[PDB]
Design a protein around this ligand. Structure first.
Ligand SMILES: C[C@H](NC(=S)Nc1ccc(NC(=O)c2cscn2)cc1)c1cc(C(F)(F)F)cc(C(F)(F)F)c1
Ligand SMILES: C[C@H](NC(=S)Nc1ccc(NC(=O)c2cscn2)cc1)c1cc(C(F)(F)F)cc(C(F)(F)F)c1
Ligand SMILES: C[C@H](NC(=S)Nc1ccc(NC(=O)c2cscn2)cc1)c1cc(C(F)(F)F)cc(C(F)(F)F)c1
Ligand SMILES: *[C@@H]1O[C@H](CO)[C@@H](O)[C@H](O)[C@H]1NC(C)=O
Ligand SMILES: *[C@@H]1O[C@H](CO)[C@@H](O)[C@H](O)[C@H]1NC(C)=O
Ligand SMILES: [Ca+2]
Lengths: 638, 638, 638
């Protein structure tokens, strides 16, 4: 199954942005000049090359966790992490020996608080070792992989720190005009990658003054994790100290320039309707409809000399492709610059009753041009439709219209693209179970999977999706209602779960496609389900009533009811008006005209005293005192 | 940015209704008559003009609010509003002096309860002043804009009223045959606007008998709010006392009639396939396919004499547009009434080897007609697709297919249309923040905006949407996970929030459209995110696990789990079976055969006594008594 | 209204499976051979007939319910059902006399527990009577329709059983190659319906060995429910004892075989572009584009002799349909097998300046073929679009593209089809109310309906949907905000609810379709709503703020906020860290350096004692003891 390998792509950061431009206008191609020409043209747009240069990021996560230890259990009373960038000497030590210290020494506005890794009060060094989230364009070298659950002595509230020095090596990508590069994780900095010390006017720079360091001949270790690797001196290295991280990169070298060509497509039949100055290339591809101004762009122009020779030959071959001797060439090659920005160039071609033949050919050409002109609108319609379908599942739409497996994610108003991460591909066991072990009456919705990220030894838990791609998480449970005939696609083979235990594998042949079933299927059987009906017709339709199986329709008819559930449910365990007071309303609810005022005043005084009494009673020491005095009185009775 | 002004259109009442008719059928245009004609026709449908006449509505909102006042805080023990229509003399006073009373005097079935504005027990008068929700088709003149939070004396439960006399001036719209008009706010009445006293048979009337008043020469003030304006006597005014409002309007005058024409479109090439009686106008616009019966509609007909002359000239000009002398006219103009109801009229045109030319022309015409016939189906398909896309975002779909900014809202099964309200356009500050100030760890999803409704001085709070339109509310928060690169479109300029603090404005050029990127993009970068992965692989995937960023797909896989959350969460703080009883089950849960019965009986008696004891204990006076007796006993020990 | 009868189709089990195959490829039809032919062909695909044979299923549901009875109310302390298949002798008794016993006698691993229907300790017999869920393809004969709410003696915890013997008669459907048949309810078994005792190699069998019984001449009662019906001896009957049911069926007889033909369609104009071996039938239907290998399939083949004669005649008639004498036949009929698997057969046809005419005809044919070739892609695009629209409402999409009323439901990755159940059609009262009677401030979203399932006398409750089809449940409530103008479609007639009380019926003519309104509507009115605005601009936008009326858009902007509501709401009434302990954190929260440790230790000891004291206090007997000793001490004071 090399066609569809396991992939966990549901996450996509920046470095790629695409949009769905709203307004595109089609023309009205019947102003003048019922007579018209035809030739052979080839089309290509303008593109720019990006740059990838493998930045590095240093960071140090420190978290406090305070807890209390009972005799048999240990309660955690909350925890809080925070990220702080390391000082410069620590970064020098990291880049020189691939080991970092275990004592952070920040100062907060009046004095220093020397934190420690394990409250051991030592200045030791810790190595770096690989982490369990690898890629082809990412790596980590965290130094404390585990978490510390030290129970400690009973009845002793104590707090601990977990300094977790880390280095990561991502790959960034910047585009023209090269004045901000976004890394793989998501960090964005407004500095040109080509900015060395003395290129302020030529290359952009807008970050800060004393947050920038350029080092020449910086001895950097080749690969972290190995205790003693081999060093290698780079030319220039740049550091960009931020408030919570440190970014570093190699000062890149000057860019190569060849030209901007794409080779969009090469057509074979075009139609030209010259109105007055707006030569229309009504191409017969039914997807190309351009416009240009009636001026040759001077083929000997100083912006396209790479394709200058390559411009001619292809046209010639396409001529010899189909126009051997019946069709004769007409003039030299011509070059037109369109309104969009793409250069398109073409070669003209041509071939009593001769007048009749010419009239027939002209009429047919006019008909075809008008048909294409009317066809122009469905492209606008399709873009409009996709602009709304992309709100349901961007990944599917983009992968369908690009013919590549692509993971995309919304970023407010513009999509962000990325490829798919690839799992080990060897150890992925699909459990033959769907029932939640702990909870009776609830079973998973999609089979649970246990994959393993590359170059690691730590298992995970995800759930199978469509086309054999893993989606993260283990929380797609659902109440479930026997019998069931779930079938999951892993093309070209489908799993068949019957009553939630893995009946058998089935080859994908006994499920007729709707496309091949446009004709009359014999007859639907009109089946029924009795558990759901018996549950509805006893009025406890709360949880198992429906699972919204036809989701996006049946789901929005119920949401306004869940909102009321949540509101009413929240109001009761939400701080009331001093629940003891809640009776007074009922006291006035029944009857009473003016006794209510005096009753309210007396109740106010009484409640003022009793609330203090109860507040004293709630502390354990006060409760013990009450118990002691009660026992003492009872003993005194004797 | 005059192209896209700020607008707050997310609300749309009636007065406009549109539908998505399901079944439209395409024909089979090859019965007979392979030979066929062609001409030039122009098409227009039938429309009717509406009527807008600026009704007025009087109302009086009165609300009770009861509260208790502690020493440092004031609790509100609920409140309730209610709307009541004012009596007739109050309306006369309002329309004569633009000031209304402050004492409502309803009777409830046995006696009168004279309410008062502030329990001041006076019969004063209050002026009317403008409200903070204006429009081009709405206004209000509320008399008490604020709310009364009078603390009052401590320890005194008291209730207050807030009589809030109001008048509003909307604009209604009614359509043929003029027998019900719906106002802007949403009120609908079944009375023809032309119904004066003596038009029962000619104009509809179906509301009631003693709920209608017609006044001649009613002295009405010109504009409320000004203490002394200039009066103006209208001809007839009508009042329609309802149970909770009073509607009034001017008795309109008799309608003008000219004709019903639309000028749908003017084509240039048509194709006619006369089968036996069903002349088919297979127009070359690829969107027009009509049918009619083989009978001229008698151009000298008494329903279209306005366009009678205008019918001919346009055809002539289009002839001179393209048919100078090669194409000769054929007969007189002809008029056909289609099956839909639209009248279409046309002028016929025409021009050894002549037979060959005729055969070629006929074959080409047949081919084009068949192509259009096959094209007829995609319109049905597109309507079917839009019928389901309209369930995702009606406003976007309707604005796309109408090329106007339109706000629409479902009304059960039929859409309701309206334009967009326009804000002051001058003072709209977009805050450069996204973090919720009070709650740490939660930050907004779209930037928060502070606009200002026209002709007011009271700020509001809304959130920015797409294409620079404000959507109401301040509640789109979300847990959020650094780093972020949010980009919001305000065409043609996009805001860029990096880590939720307003990095900088960016011109909309560095985001390549997918339409212009049909070709091969270089390569996606395969990025990753470590915070989400570390959160998943420790099994606390509850709140920050996912935000359903690719919403409508990832959202319905989780809904059945939120349902279980809500159910289990509700069950516990929901009235149990007298929680003291809950132990008995466990008492029988472990073991026991027949001791359970006796234990249950004894527990029943004990619980019967103890519940009464606890009910006595819960009142503050009983608690104070218990405290007093305990202290007295302890003192007595001494 | 026979066009749209009431139907309750929202449920669909298996027995029908369809799929949405992803990749379909269009060709490039310009390799070679600019010259090309044309003929007349007819097309039909391959289909297989299914089998329906009316299985039977026996089952016995037994449920335990334990409860306690107070003096005025009766609490139920949970209940649990379970399904168990009956033994063989009980099934023999059921099939011989249509009455079943009331005493289940299972054994659990060490001894028998004889359950009883009502703890009456008797071995009586109970009849079978019809149930209130009937169909054309389902029935039930449950023996205990009601539920037992016997109050019993006060203060006596007791449990009861409700044995509910049942038999059902569904209809299954199996398809080629007949090796698993799925019943209507949802049960699936992997046995060929034709498997009698001695067909192991010819017919599949994969269930088990000692879970199968074949009985010859089994005297089976004709119809259950009647105390004494007429018997009828079938040939062979098969039982398939499962763990919780018993399935039975008649051993079917050998299948008939005629042929596999469908008669897809009969075209009239085709275009053939023979490249080298891949004759392309570029049909002019604009939906047919095939491919085959250059070899006749030997019309005298032993797989299609049924249509062998019928193959010729239709072609002939279509010739006489349009080709009388101008068009002459060319050779004999030819038969081509396509790549898909469908056989298509065709008859060729044909008809100085002759060369010119031939060139014109060839050029036109090439143009039309290229247009169809370019058209091939929109079918792929439409399938891609429907693959995502089917995630919103499968029923609507399938019913639109099949032109039949079809209820479909997702089954993981493949759709399941069924027709619509039909209600009595006579007694369906649509209540003229929408306000929830018990709850003030909440009113239904769609009108509530009271239908009645066929052949029953037990009312139900459902809600009206679109196109006059009932959807089950009574839980689509919503907070609601006057005024309202709801209009519900029951084509061709719409209900109009104004302020939620059934204003009047309206014929469907005063709502203009968007399809007929492509032109300029006069002007939208720009209406407004004041209740919603006043609710927003006072900051209590929690429940009535919005109902997500434009659902699928406004709904996913709020979901991440409901998630936080649920999380925060759950955390508080979720088992805390022994709430008495919660103070210690605040004790260390303010200040303290080392007194916290000693305070924590003392608090630990005190809490250890006090928790035991409170646990003793929570039992009713301990509370009564405390009350007794307190009263005794107070009396002793005297
Ligand atoms: C009928 C009477 N009801 C009272 S006195 N209701 C009440 C409740 C609350 C407040 N005030 C505040 O809650 C408050 C908060 S801040 C300021 N005031 C004031 C009055 C009653 C009194 C007794 C007694 F005499 F034994 F106490 C027992 C019962 C019994 F047996 F039915 F339970 C009933
Ligand atoms: C094991 C025994 N358990 C009992 S007696 N359980 C029980 C609970 C509830 C009910 N009945 C109702 O709740 C009821 C509601 S309406 C009608 N009846 C009846 C019985 C037990 C008794 C004592 C004692 F003697 F001190 F009380 C202390 C403990 C201790 F130390 F473990 F806590 C345990
Ligand atoms: C300020 C002082 N606060 C204390 S002592 N706080 C505290 C709370 C909890 C724990 N420990 C555990 O909860 C625990 C669970 S497991 C192990 N330990 C330990 C200490 C205080 C003491 C009194 C007194 F003396 F009357 F009691 C009254 C008040 C008053 F008037 F303000 F209410 C305040
Ligand atoms: C280079 O940068 C300097 C900044 O000091 C600027 O003044 C100058 O115009 C730029 N260009 C050249 C050619 O020096
Ligand atoms: C029939 O089934 C038997 C199973 O014992 C198998 O050995 C045999 O090959 C099958 N076919 C024939 C023709 O006997
Ligand atoms: Ca199309």
């Amino acid at each position: 199954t090399t066609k569809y390998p396991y992939r966990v792509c549901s996450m996509a950061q920046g470095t790629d942005l695409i949009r769905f431009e709203r307004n595109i206008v089609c023309t009205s191609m019947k102003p003048i000049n019922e007579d018209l020409d035809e030739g052979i043209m080839v089309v290509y747009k303008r593109n720019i090359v990006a740059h990838t240069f493998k930045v590095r990021v240093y960071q140090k996560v420190l978290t406090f966790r305070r807890s209390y230890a009972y005799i048999h259990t240990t309660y955690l009373l909350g925890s809080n992490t925070e990220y702080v960038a390391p000082p410069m000497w620590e970064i020098h030590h990291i880049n020189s020996h691939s080991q970092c210290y275990s004592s952070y020494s920040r100062v907060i506005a009046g004095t220093v608080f020397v934190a420690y890794h394990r409250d051991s009060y030592e200045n030791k060094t810790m190595q770096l070792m690989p982490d369990d989230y690898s890629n082809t364009h990412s790596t980590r070298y965290v130094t404390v992989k585990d978490q510390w659950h030290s129970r400690g002595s009973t009845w002793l509230y104590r707090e601990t720190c977990n300094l977790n020095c880390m280095v990561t090596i991502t790959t960034a990508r910047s585009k023209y005009p090269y004045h901000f590069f976004a890394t793989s994780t998501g960090d964005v900095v407004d500095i040109s990658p080509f900015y060395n010390g003395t290129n302020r006017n030529a290359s952009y720079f807008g970050e800060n003054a004393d947050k920038f360091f350029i080092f020449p001949n910086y001895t950097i270790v080749s690969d972290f994790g190995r205790p003693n690797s081999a060093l290698e001196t780079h030319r220039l290295v740049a550091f960009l100290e931020r408030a919570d991280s440190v970014i570093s990169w190699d000062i890149q070298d000057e860019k190569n320039v060849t030209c901007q060509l794409t080779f969009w497509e090469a057509s074979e039949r075009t139609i030209r309707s010259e109105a007055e100055d707006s030569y229309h290339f009504s191409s017969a591809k039914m997807t190309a409809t351009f416009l240009s101004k009636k001026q040759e762009v001077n083929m000997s122009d100083s912006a396209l000399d790479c394709v200058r020779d390559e411009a001619i030959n292809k046209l010639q071959q396409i001529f010899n492709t189909s126009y051997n001797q019946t069709y004769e060439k007409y003039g030299n090659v011509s070059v037109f610059e369109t309104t969009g920005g793409l250069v398109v160039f073409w070669q003209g071609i041509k071939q009593q009753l001769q007048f009749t033949y010419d009239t027939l050919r002209g009429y047919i050409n006019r008909a075809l041009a008008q048909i294409a002109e009317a066809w122009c609108v469905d492209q606008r319609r399709t873009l409009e439709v996709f602009k709304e379908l992309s709100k349901i599942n961007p990944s599917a739409i983009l992968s369908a219209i690009y013919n590549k497996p692509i993971a995309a994610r919304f970023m407010g108003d513009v999509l962000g693209l990325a490829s798919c991460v690839t799992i080990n591909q060897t150890s992925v066991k699909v459990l033959r179970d769907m029932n939640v072990k702990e909870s009776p009456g609830r079973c998973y919705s999609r089979p649970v999977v246990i994959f393993n990220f590359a170059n690691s030894s730590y298992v995970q838990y995800g759930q199978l999706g469509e086309d054999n791609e893993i989606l993260l998480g283990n929380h797609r449970t659902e109440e479930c209602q026997l019998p069931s005939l779930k079938i999951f696609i892993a093309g070209n083979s489908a799993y068949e779960y019957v009553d939630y235990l893995f009946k058998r594998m089935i080859d994908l042949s006994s499920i007729s496609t709707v496309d091949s079933m446009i004709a009359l299927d014999i007859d639907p059987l009109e089946n029924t389900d009795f558990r759901v009906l018996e549950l509805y017709s006893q009025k406890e339709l709360r949880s198992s009533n429906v699972f919204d199986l036809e989701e996006i329709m049946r789901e929005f008819n119920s949401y306004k009811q869940r909102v009321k559930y949540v509101e009413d449910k929240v109001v009761d365990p939400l701080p009331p008006y001093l629940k003891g007071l809640d009776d007074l309303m009922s006291g006035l609810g029944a009857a009473g005209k003016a006794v209510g005022v005096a009753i309210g005043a007396v109740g106010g005084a009484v409640a003022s005293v009793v609330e203090g009494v109860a507040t004293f009673l709630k502390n354990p020491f006060g409760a013990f005192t009450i118990i002691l005095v009660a026992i003492a009185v009872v003993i005194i009775i004797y």
